[PDB]
Amino acid sequence: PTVFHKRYLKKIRDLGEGHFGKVSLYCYDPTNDGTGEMVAVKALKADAGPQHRSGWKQEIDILRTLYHEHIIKYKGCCEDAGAASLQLVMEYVPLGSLRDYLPRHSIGLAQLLLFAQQICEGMAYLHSQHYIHRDLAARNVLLDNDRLVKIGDFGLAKAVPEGHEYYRDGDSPVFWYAPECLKEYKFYYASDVWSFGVTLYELLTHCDSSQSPPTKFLELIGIAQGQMTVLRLTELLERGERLPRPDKCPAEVYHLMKNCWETEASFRPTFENLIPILKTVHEKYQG
Ligand SMILES: O=C(N[C@@]12C[C@@H]1CN(c1nc(Nc3cnn(CCO)c3)ncc1F)C2)C1CC1
């Protein structure tokens, strides 16, 4: 409901960009004194078509109703006159994504497992509101402080239809996708759990680019495959091939990743089942 007046918005820097959206940091200072607030503002590119434009209004709606400690805070909206839509105004998460943070700060196993647990809490909450994330990766997990992580983007999030268990593109994050998404084109709550396992893998590799899911999966498929990357990915996953065990990852946590990566979606734990398990594995490594 909150409206941001564009007259007090001074752009500081870019925070991220996708194929149709962009996030920039702004100072919102209705003075010029030291009462100024730091905000993250998401805008839809003015060139985006009607499908992306209607999906944008849906994204804004989803964030307006989502309230959880491990989910980015919605701040307000403002008229984006140049793009002839709205701009999504959110809180500025000071330490950025884990994708950018982890390659530069050696973090202990216990802190990573705590982050893992916080992602699950945020995701179980999202699933209880009947939404699927569709884009759970370390790039969408924002660090507030060394003990607080938040799901910071909902660009692909969809409401699961009332009498259905699932929701039915070159921008799709295929290297974080369960075989049922790639093959049957169906996204279940269990499909987000697969993606979590990929995000947990990223955390345990400290988001090293040479260990990343696209790097690792493209080394297994090869690069001279024509339009067959997705087809070849679907078949290595069906032969039980998986992302390796990250160096310094305990066997137990790796088994847990493998359980999120069950080919049979029904054999995957829910995010509710993951919470007490992660609490327990974290308490262990914290001491
Ligand atoms: O950029 C996008 N989505 C989000 C998840 C990305 C980063 N974003 C946000 N980032 C931050 N803080 C911060 C600090 N540093 N850095 C850059 C290093 O990571 C980002 N706060 C709020 C946000 F909303 C939103 C969509 C493709 C356009």
Side-chain angles (χ1 to χ4, degrees), residues 1-18 21-287:
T2 325
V3 171
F4 271 78
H5 308 294
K6 224 105 144 71
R7 83 180 172 276
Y8 304 119
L9 283 180
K10 195 188 175 175
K11 207 196 175 84
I12 303 162
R13 58 182 172 276
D14 291 323
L15 299 185
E17 191 179 45
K22 187 159 81 66
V23 177
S24 302
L25 166 67
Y26 286 86
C27 183
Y28 195 70
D29 223 321
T31 25
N32 252 292
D33 95 321
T35 59
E37 201 53 60
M38 290 232 275
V39 290
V41 176
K42 192 169 187 177
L44 185 70
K45 290 168 171 77
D47 58 280
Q51 181 55 218
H52 291 308
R53 285 196 173 263
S54 69
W56 176 232
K57 300 184 189 182
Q58 275 168 256
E59 185 182 339
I60 289 181
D61 291 350
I62 295 170
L63 209 42
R64 269 154 85 181
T65 59
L66 296 165
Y67 220 85
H68 194 265
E69 63 170 338
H70 303 298
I71 296 201
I72 192 172
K73 282 184 201 295
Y74 172 79
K75 246 60 181 65
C77 275
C78 71
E79 260 191 328
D80 194 348
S85 64
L86 300 165
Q87 260 178 312
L88 185 49
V89 191
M90 302 162 292
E91 82 184 302
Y92 174 55
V93 187
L95 311 174
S97 77
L98 288 185
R99 199 196 181 263
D100 299 298
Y101 184 84
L102 305 175
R104 314 183 110 245
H105 303 73
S106 47
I107 298 293
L109 173 63
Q111 284 165 76
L112 294 176
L113 298 165
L114 173 71
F115 294 167
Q117 197 201 128
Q118 291 177 355
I119 294 158
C120 298
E121 295 182 347
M123 285 301 295
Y125 169 78
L126 187 69
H127 288 178
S128 75
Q129 300 308 109
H130 298 81
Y131 292 111
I132 45 156
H133 193 274
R134 292 175 58 216
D135 197 17
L136 182 63
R139 75 186 150 268
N140 293 321
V141 177
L142 307 176
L143 223 215
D144 202 301
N145 60 74
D146 57 39
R147 263 75 182 161
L148 176 70
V149 107
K150 283 159 170 176
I151 301 156
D153 194 83
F154 295 91
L156 297 190
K158 284 293 169 196
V160 179
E162 237 58 75
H164 302 273
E165 48 181 33
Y166 62 83
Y167 176 88
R168 280 177 262 255
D169 278 40
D171 82 301
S172 301
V174 303
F175 296 118
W176 281 255
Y177 276 8
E180 73 272 3
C181 309
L182 304 174
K183 221 182 182 73
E184 291 142 64
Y185 301 97
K186 300 163 187 179
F187 202 104
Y188 297 83
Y189 289 117
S191 304
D192 274 328
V193 175
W194 177 287
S195 295
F196 168 73
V198 190
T199 304
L200 179 57
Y201 169 82
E202 288 186 276
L203 270 54
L204 274 322
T205 63
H206 304 267
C207 297
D208 180 21
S209 294
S210 62
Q211 300 192 258
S212 81
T215 301
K216 287 280 150 163
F217 282 130
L218 281 162
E219 281 167 6
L220 290 172
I221 291 150
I223 53 145
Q225 306 300 316
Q227 295 179 281
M228 285 172 172
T229 311
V230 172
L231 257 161
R232 285 228 154 266
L233 172 66
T234 305
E235 60 181 57
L236 74 88
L237 293 182
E238 284 172 332
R239 290 189 308 266
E241 275 170 75
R242 294 296 183 263
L243 283 166
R245 186 178 157 193
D247 174 12
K248 297 178 272 88
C249 176
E252 51 210 67
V253 182
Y254 188 56
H255 298 144
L256 190 141
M257 268 152 60
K258 278 255 199 169
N259 198 228
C260 299
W261 304 327
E262 286 292 319
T263 298
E264 180 55 58
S266 79
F267 297 177
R268 289 176 208 149
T270 60
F271 284 111
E272 296 276 25
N273 306 151
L274 283 167
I275 301 157
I277 290 178
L278 285 159
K279 261 176 170 80
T280 305
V281 178
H282 166 65
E283 291 162 335
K284 169 168 170 178
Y285 293 105
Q286 211 200 322

